[PDB]
Scaffold this active site. Sequence first.
Site, PDB file in Angstrom:
ATOM      1  N   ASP A  24       0.787  -1.221   0.000  1.00 27.19           N
ATOM      2  CA  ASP A  24       0.000   0.000   0.000  1.00 27.19           C
ATOM      3  C   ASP A  24       0.820   1.272   0.000  1.00 27.19           C
ATOM      4  OD1 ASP A  24      -1.876   1.927   0.332  1.00 27.19           O
ATOM      5  OD2 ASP A  24      -2.933   0.917   1.952  1.00 27.19           O
ATOM      6  N   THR A  25       1.030   1.866  -1.199  1.00 28.26           N
ATOM      7  CA  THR A  25       1.821   3.090  -1.297  1.00 28.26           C
ATOM      8  C   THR A  25       1.171   4.294  -0.635  1.00 28.26           C
ATOM      9  OG1 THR A  25       0.957   3.576  -3.506  1.00 28.26           O
ATOM     10  CG2 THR A  25       2.948   2.264  -3.381  1.00 28.26           C
ATOM     11  N   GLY A  26      -0.142   4.243  -0.447  1.00 25.90           N
ATOM     12  CA  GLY A  26      -0.862   5.317   0.216  1.00 25.90           C
ATOM     13  C   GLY A  26      -0.833   5.250   1.726  1.00 25.90           C
TER      14      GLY A  26
HETATM   15  C1  23L Z   1      -3.271   9.223   3.889  1.00 28.79           C
HETATM   16  C2  23L Z   1      -4.301   8.153   3.613  1.00 28.79           C
HETATM   17  C3  23L Z   1      -4.395   8.034   2.118  1.00 28.79           C
HETATM   18  C4  23L Z   1      -4.028   6.772   4.193  1.00 28.79           C
HETATM   19  C5  23L Z   1      -3.895   6.814   5.705  1.00 28.79           C
HETATM   20  C6  23L Z   1      -3.116   5.674   6.304  1.00 28.79           C
HETATM   21  C7  23L Z   1      -1.916   5.936   6.939  1.00 28.79           C
HETATM   22  C8  23L Z   1      -1.166   4.916   7.485  1.00 28.79           C
HETATM   23  F1  23L Z   1       0.014   5.178   8.061  1.00 28.79           F
HETATM   24  C9  23L Z   1      -1.597   3.611   7.467  1.00 28.79           C
HETATM   25  C10 23L Z   1      -2.809   3.338   6.880  1.00 28.79           C
HETATM   26  C11 23L Z   1      -3.535   4.357   6.300  1.00 28.79           C
HETATM   27  S1  23L Z   1      -5.092   3.917   5.579  1.00 28.79           S
HETATM   28  O1  23L Z   1      -5.233   2.487   5.560  1.00 28.79           O
HETATM   29  O2  23L Z   1      -6.121   4.698   6.234  1.00 28.79           O
HETATM   30  N1  23L Z   1      -5.029   4.461   3.994  1.00 28.79           N
HETATM   31  C12 23L Z   1      -4.291   3.637   3.027  1.00 28.79           C
HETATM   32  C13 23L Z   1      -5.217   3.208   1.904  1.00 28.79           C
HETATM   33  O3  23L Z   1      -4.465   2.593   0.876  1.00 28.79           O
HETATM   34  C14 23L Z   1      -6.383   2.306   2.292  1.00 28.79           C
HETATM   35  C15 23L Z   1      -6.001   0.883   2.688  1.00 28.79           C
HETATM   36  C16 23L Z   1      -7.208   0.123   3.109  1.00 28.79           C
HETATM   37  C17 23L Z   1      -7.814  -0.724   2.200  1.00 28.79           C
HETATM   38  C18 23L Z   1      -8.968  -1.395   2.564  1.00 28.79           C
HETATM   39  C19 23L Z   1      -9.492  -1.235   3.827  1.00 28.79           C
HETATM   40  C20 23L Z   1      -8.869  -0.417   4.741  1.00 28.79           C
HETATM   41  C21 23L Z   1      -7.730   0.273   4.382  1.00 28.79           C
HETATM   42  N2  23L Z   1      -7.321   2.305   1.188  1.00 28.79           N
HETATM   43  C22 23L Z   1      -8.504   3.002   1.201  1.00 28.79           C
HETATM   44  O4  23L Z   1      -8.920   3.718   2.102  1.00 28.79           O
HETATM   45  O5  23L Z   1      -9.141   2.748   0.012  1.00 28.79           O
HETATM   46  C23 23L Z   1     -10.347   3.470  -0.222  1.00 28.79           C
HETATM   47  C24 23L Z   1     -10.001   4.814  -0.817  1.00 28.79           C
HETATM   48  C25 23L Z   1     -10.496   4.754  -2.239  1.00 28.79           C
HETATM   49  O6  23L Z   1     -10.566   3.371  -2.531  1.00 28.79           O
HETATM   50  C26 23L Z   1     -11.027   2.738  -1.346  1.00 28.79           C
HETATM   51  C27 23L Z   1      -5.205   5.907   3.770  1.00 28.79           C
END
Ligand code: 23L
Lengths: 99, 99
Positions: B25-27
């Site tokens: 997960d690059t995000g």
């Molecule tokens: C600074 C923000 C970006 C990030 C904030 C963040 C920061 C961290 F240090 C760790 C995790 C996350 S996060 O998981 O909240 N996420 C990464 C995203 O890649 C998530 C991963 C994920 C996938 C599935 C279930 C829970 C978490 N994808 C996400 O939220 O996808 C949504 C967004 C559009 O498509 C669907 C957003």
Amino acid sequence: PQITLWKRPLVTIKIGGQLKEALLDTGADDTVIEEMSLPGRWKPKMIGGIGGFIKVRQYDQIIIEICGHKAIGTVLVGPTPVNIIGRNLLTQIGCTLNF
Amino acid sequence: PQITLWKRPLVTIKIGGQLKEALLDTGADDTVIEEMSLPGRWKPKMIGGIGGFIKVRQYDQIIIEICGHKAIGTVLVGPTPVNIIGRNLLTQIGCTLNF
Ligand SMILES: CC(C)[C@H]1Cc2cc(F)ccc2S(=O)(=O)N(C[C@@H](O)[C@H](Cc2ccccc2)NC(=O)O[C@H]2CCOC2)C1
Ligand SMILES: [Cl-]
Ligand SMILES: [Cl-]
Ligand SMILES: [Cl-]
């Protein structure tokens, strides 16, 4: 380009003639941008993430440029904390992960 | 390897003597794993994502193996809906975005 991950992979995008900053996010299935005006009709969608969900507006077939690469596809609009370019558009620009 | 983005970039990881599936997960700035035991000290942390914040336990200096690539870093443990490999470990395995 080749983008390393020592910092957030933030790029400039262009949508509706406006430049915005967005995150290239392999963990996001979909592209979600902060509140803005887009043309046409929208459909409802729910996106699940870390601390729960947000309701978003789904706009299809939207013209969007990502780091100069032109794409046309689905953009979700809603109360996301950051603009996110997800897999649906990362594939259009030919993005891969490599190690 | 080269990983395309037509589907979620899920990989097998080895952590704390367990095998888990996790998303490259690059995000995500941080690595966050579903509830599990890890050795050593931890401190509480809040992390935010699309749907608000979750409380996690922060464990430092944890060894993980991702696709035969060993790394070490901080691992957060908590109620994440998906196991996430974030940038803090992606950099260590030499992972880049390419287009
Ligand atoms: C600074 C923000 C970006 C990030 C904030 C963040 C920061 C961290 F240090 C760790 C995790 C996350 S996060 O998981 O909240 N996420 C990464 C995203 O890649 C998530 C991963 C994920 C996938 C599935 C279930 C829970 C978490 N994808 C996400 O939220 O996808 C949504 C967004 C559009 O498509 C669907 C957003
Ligand atoms: Cl699309
Ligand atoms: Cl770290
Ligand atoms: Cl490097």
